[PDB]
Amino acid sequence: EQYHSQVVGKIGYIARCMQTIDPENNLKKIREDYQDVLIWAEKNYRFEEILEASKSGKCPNDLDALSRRSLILQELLRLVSSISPFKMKLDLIESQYEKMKQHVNLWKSDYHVKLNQLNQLTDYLKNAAPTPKNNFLRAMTSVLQMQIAQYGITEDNEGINQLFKLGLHLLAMANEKIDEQYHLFKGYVKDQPEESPFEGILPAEDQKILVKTMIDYAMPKLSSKVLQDKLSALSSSDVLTKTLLDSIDRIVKENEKL
Amino acid sequence: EQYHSQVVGKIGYIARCMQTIDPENNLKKIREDYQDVLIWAEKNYRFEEILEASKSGKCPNDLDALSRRSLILQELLRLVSSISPFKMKLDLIESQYEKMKQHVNLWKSDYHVKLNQLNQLTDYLKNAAPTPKNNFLRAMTSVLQMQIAQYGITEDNEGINQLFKLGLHLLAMANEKIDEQYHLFKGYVKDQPEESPFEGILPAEDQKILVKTMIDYAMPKLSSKVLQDKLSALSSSDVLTKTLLDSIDRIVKENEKL
């Protein structure tokens, strides 16, 4: 979708740039650098097929890495195109490629990549339908935005870097993996320092939808009426907390013995 | 798009960024860094007044520098805009600005600036009207394209740096200062090693046009019809050579001796 379509676009664009840079297939060093990507554009796959390969992790699907590696070939294509009709010798092209490589890699790092990754999260949520994944993602992103407002992105912050890791992973995760989504979000809430991490950060209406979501997930998995009675009452809270989640986890433990 | 017109465009875009980042004029250090820009753009000047200031040097008119300085504020605006509705303390904003400034300054340097300047000349020459200025510029850019194909732009080459400097200077030169255009091109041809620096590079069709350009320039300056006929005798050459310009100069010297 919004993410894996850009992955396929970057894969097709890298191959287009490589072919125009090296129209006679002689820049073996550069093509070996990109063969992990180029193979998916040379194997007669359709757009839908590469899309499913990106969702299943069969092809390169790190959009930020693909974007950085596309910029390298784009820079080299600009040079090759701007000196037309004059050809450059093959080893000189590779010499230019190595310098552009380290130059672009430095630019595509530090605060800049974090800034791009935040945009990936907000753009993905721009018109996202209210799903558990999208509710988890919008809650995590709002915490991320609040922490960046307090700490910035030019220095390293472990809590922010964890939100980027888990958030982007949830973003690229398949929409049908309900268990993996619930596991990721419950993992983040437990593995973060604050007790009520969403207080003052999300509207009160959204905080209740989060509580109702976690309740409706474990509700059909109670192998006893008595265990499913108290869990239904835990919806009396309107803020997702670590105590509320541990309360749900304890009910699954008492039901696991039965 | 004319050079100085692009200068005004970036001057305006910098002011709109600053107004969105700091609407109440509290980031004193950032506005101090951009004071040479904002003193023109934060007032109600007409476009033509800023344009005349750029063409006369009264306001910053380095298009690559202005592009670099604009990217810093573009990145800083992205951060402030991407964390909304959460806001950042003013000290943190200026702290993020300093690190973004150093990061962008690394990106907007080295081969990348030269690539932008080469792309700037080739963009301008795309379907450009065959005027003396554009013919002079296309002749120098073609020599620049050839030398780059031979040496690249990732390593420093002094001959290439002079073609950029002279090429961009002629690119920004007013289309009406025709005697200044001729003098620049005449000076490049004389201050370069090759006797005929355009053969093997520029097409023979354009070399003949380049010769006829130098003849149509010095013909009105001829007062006596005897010298006017001596200049047309030089038109039998299809190669612009150092000797052809020395001959046209000697014919122009004896005309002033009357």
Residue numbers in the entry:
A (entry chain B), B (entry chain A): 16 to 273
Question: What does the paper behind this entry write?
Answer:
The protein SidK, secreted by Legionella pneumophila, interacts with the V-ATPase to inhibit acidification of the phagolysosome in the early stages of infection. V-ATPases pump protons across a phospholipid membrane using energy from the hydrolysis of adenosine triphosphate (ATP) to adenosine diphosphate (ADP) and inorganic phosphate. Successful pathogens can subvert host defenses by secreting effectors that target V-ATPases to inhibit lysosomal acidification or lysosomal fusion with other cell compartments. This study reveals the structure of the V-ATPase:SidK complex, an assembly formed from the interaction of host and pathogen proteins involved in the infection of phagocytic white blood cells by Legionella pneumophila. Removal of the C-terminal residues 415–573 of SidK did not significantly affect V-ATPase inhibition by the SidK mutants, but truncations of the N-terminal region of the protein has been demonstrated to prevent V-ATPase inhibition. These data show that binding of the N-terminal domain of SidK to the V-ATPase is responsible for its partial yet specific inhibition of V-ATPase activity.
The second crystal form of SidK(16–278) contained two molecules in the asymmetric unit related by a non-crystallographic two-fold symmetry. In this crystal form SidK-N exists as a dimer, with the two molecules swapping their second and third α-helical bundles (red arrowheads and oval). The domain swapping retains the interface between the first and second α-helical bundles seen in the first crystal form and the domain-swapped monomer is similar to the monomer in the first crystal form. The monomeric SidK predominates in solution, even at high concentrations, and therefore the elongated monomer structure is expected to be the functional state of the protein. The flexibility between the first and second α-helical bundles is consistent with the flexibility in the linker between these bundles observed by X-ray crystallography.
